[PDB]
Amino acid sequence: STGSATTTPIDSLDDAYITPVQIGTPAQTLNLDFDTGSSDLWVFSSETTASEVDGQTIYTPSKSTTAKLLSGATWSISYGDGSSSSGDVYTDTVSVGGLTVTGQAVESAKKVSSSFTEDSTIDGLLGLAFSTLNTVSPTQQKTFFDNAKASLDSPVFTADLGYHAPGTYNFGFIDTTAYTGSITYTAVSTKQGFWEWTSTGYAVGSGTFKSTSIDGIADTGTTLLYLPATVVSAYWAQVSGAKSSSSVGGYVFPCSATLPSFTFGVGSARIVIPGDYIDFGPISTGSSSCFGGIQSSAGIGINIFGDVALKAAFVVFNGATTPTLGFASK
Ligand SMILES: NCCc1ccc(S(=O)(=O)F)cc1
Numbered sequence: 001s002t003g004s005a006t007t008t009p010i011d012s013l014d015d016a017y018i019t020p021v022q023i024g025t026p027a028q029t030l031n032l033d034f035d036t037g038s039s040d041l042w043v044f045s046s047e048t049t050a051s052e053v054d055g056q057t058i059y060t061p062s063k064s065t066t067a068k069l070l071s072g073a074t075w076s077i078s079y080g081d082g083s084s085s086s087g088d089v090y091t092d093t094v095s096v097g098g099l100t101v102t103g104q105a106v107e108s109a110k111k112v113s114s115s116f117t118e119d120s121t122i123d124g125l126l127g128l129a130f131s132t133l134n135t136v137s138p139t140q141q142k143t144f145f146d147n148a149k150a151s152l153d154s155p156v157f158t159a160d161l162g163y164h165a166p167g168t169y170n171f172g173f174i175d176t177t178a179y180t181g182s183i184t185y186t187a188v189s190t191k192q193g194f195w196e197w198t199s200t201g202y203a204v205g206s207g208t209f210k211s212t213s214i215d216g217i218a219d220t221g222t223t224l225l226y227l228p229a230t231v232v233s234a235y236w237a238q239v240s241g242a243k244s245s246s247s248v249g250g251y252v253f254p255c256s257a258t259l260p261s262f263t264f265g266v267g268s269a270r271i272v273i274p275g276d277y278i279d280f281g282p283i284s285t286g287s288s289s290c291f292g293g294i295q296s297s298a299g300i301g302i303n304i305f306g307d308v309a310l311k312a313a314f315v316v317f318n319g320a321t322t323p324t325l326g327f328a329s330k
Contacts, residue, residue, distance in 0.1 A: 001099055001171075002098070002099060002170065003096045003099025003148075003171040004098065004169075005019050005097030005168070005169050006019070007019040007168065008166045009165070010121040010122065012281075013280055013281055014163065014164060016033050016121075016122060016307075017033065017161060017167070018121060019031065019033075019034050019096070019169055020032075022093075023106055024064030024067055024093065025066040026064075028057075029057075030043055030057050030058075030123035031057065031122065031123045032123060033122050033125045034128055035127050036128045036129055036195050036218055036219055037194060037219035037221045037222060038125065038129055039127040039128075039131055039193065040127045040133075040134055041105065041126045041127060041143065042085055042109055043059040043106060043107070043109065043124035044058045044112070044116075045059045045108040046059070046060040046108075047087060047108050048109045048112060049110065049112075052117045056116075056122070056124075057123045058123070059108065061090045061092065066092050067092045067106075068090060070136075070141075072138065073137065073141075074087070074088055074136070075088075075089060075134075075135045075136045076135055079221075080304070081115070083116060084112070084113045085109045085112040087109040089136055089141070090106045091103045091104060092106045096126075096144065097169065097171065099148055099152075099171050101144055101148050103147070105141035105142070107136065107141075109124070128144070129143070129195065130194070132190070145319060146319075148172075149319055154172055154173060154174070155318070155319045155320050156172065157169060157170060157172075157317050157319070158170045158174060158175070158316050159220055159317065160330070161310055162311065163277055167311070179314035183314070183316055183328040184267050184268070184269035184328070185267075186325050188318075188323040188324055192217075194217040195219075195325055196215065196216070196217050197215075197325050199305075200212075200265030200266065200268070202227075202231055202262065202263060203263040204238050205261055205275075206260075210234075214227065214303055215302075215303060216302060216303030217305065218315060218317070218325055219305060220306075223293075223306055224280070224294065225295070225306055226300055226304040227295075227297055228296070228297060229298045232251065232296045235262055235294050236253065238260050240257065242257070245289075248289070248291065250292060250295040251296075252283060253289070254289065254290070257290075258275060259276070259278045261273060261274050261275050262294060264309060272312060272329075273312040278294055279293065294308065313330065314330045
């Protein structure tokens with residue numbers, strides 16, 4: 001089996017990407033945020049506190065002939081940005097891009113934080129990290145990928161995120177037309193439940209490459225690139241007028257700037273993030289201060305290769321017995 005679905009940025013900044021997912025019988029299509037940094041498939045639902053729903057499409061299990069309550073199961077999750085949701089659990093048929101899983105745990109939100117309510121374009125999350133992070137209690141549940149894995153032609157999925165454009169999530173195959181050159185694979189640690197890997201270093205613009213190990217996670221659910229303070233200072237030092245603002249909550253730069261590229265290492269290979277990708281536009285509407293797409297991971301406790309980095313590459317999430325990540329230019 002394979003699946004292939006288009007993923008679409010939610011706004012002009014590429015703040016997140018949504019992918020249509022069919023749930024239930026007859027199908028209920030919800031637009032979910034595919035998140036390689038978490039392991040819960042949760043949705044806005046007919047159970048979500050009415051005051052916390054603002055435009056989202058909801059899943060109504062009572063309208064699905066295949067929905068089953070997973071009796072006694074609850075879930076509760078918190079994300080690195082302070083958002084959260086919780087609720088109860090159904091099993092149902094879930095399809096992504098033509099790939100179907102029966103008996104998938106669909107976590108129905110009773111509560112979501114304000115950040116989810118205020119984002120009308122995201123109907124829930126589909127976690128793609130390791131199932132050891134799944135929050136369902138008392139019986140932990142598997143991710144859509146882990147349930148699909150044995151059926152897939154190859155135990156892989158790929159992320160091909162667009163810059164200000166749609167992209168693709170594929171399951172079970174590697175589209176050799178979707179990238180240039182070769183794919184460089186690198187080791188993954190599953191010890192923290194993430195797609196955790198070690199970059200071999202970085203360069204700023206046309207500068208020399210600095211060989212240095214940077215542990216971090218490949219996270220499609222995080223917008224920006226979060227790296228050590230040393231690395232981030234070295235990047236923004238090349239932008240006249242850039243500074244870290246405690247009032248705004250990170251590095252800002254004059255909107256009149258042209259940003260340098262940022263290169264990160266994958267083994268002996270190099271992925272170049274164009275400078276344009278690092279522009280997140282005015283900090284408030286009409287401002288001449290712009291928000292940076294490379295920020296410090298200080299305080300977060302992990303480095304995060306979020307969408308700013310991942311969208312510069314074709315990314316293979318290899319879920320074989322020994323997991324690996326692959327990166328190619330595109
Ligand atoms: N891996 C990060 C998952 C995540 C965490 C928070 C959101 S948000 O829409 O509330 F900003 C979205 C996705």
